[PDB]
Amino acid sequence: AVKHLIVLKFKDEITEAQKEEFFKTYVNLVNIIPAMKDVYWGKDVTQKNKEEGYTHIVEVTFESVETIQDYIIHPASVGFGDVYRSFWEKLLIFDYTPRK
Template identity: 50%
Template sequence: MEEAKGPVKHIVLAKFKDGIPPDQIEQLIKSYSNLANLIEPMKAFHWGKDVSIENLHQGFTHVFESTFESVEGIAEYVAHPDHVEFATAFLPNVEKVLIIDYKPTAVHL
């Protein structure tokens, strides 16, 4: 992976398993968002549900976006005990997940 200094986005697309109660999904999302308070390189967290009219979501229903200070910050986050604990609770509740990390590039028009 290319070493990147500066902000890096960590995108997680998820489809929760059928039958997972909404309050359980809400609790998982709260736990996910709380990681920004526990893991220093995680600078921001946003999430939302798919609202696209194009129907190209391939079944993914939720989007989670975290901002990190660097690629190294993501590595620190992935290995952090609080993230490991969260992932252990989160992953059994999702049918599928896709994770992409990228360094934003400005477009000059």
């Protein structure tokens, strides 16, 4: 299993209700896209890095490196980006195999 980590900042004009809908809709993609196994999101509470200003984290689990592309080309993921592109100001994306 691999992890797909999204770190983001919303645009200032986006409301709390819009953010709640954004995450509810993203979380539901697990039910639509086979490769997408689970998702959690969170709002940062510490605000340590104020200049950068990322506020939210989304972590998705995929069964493998090879199945990420299945998600990337899935109409539901493409659709999510099409609906909500204007909501985010910036993001960082990471993909990795957890180790300990």
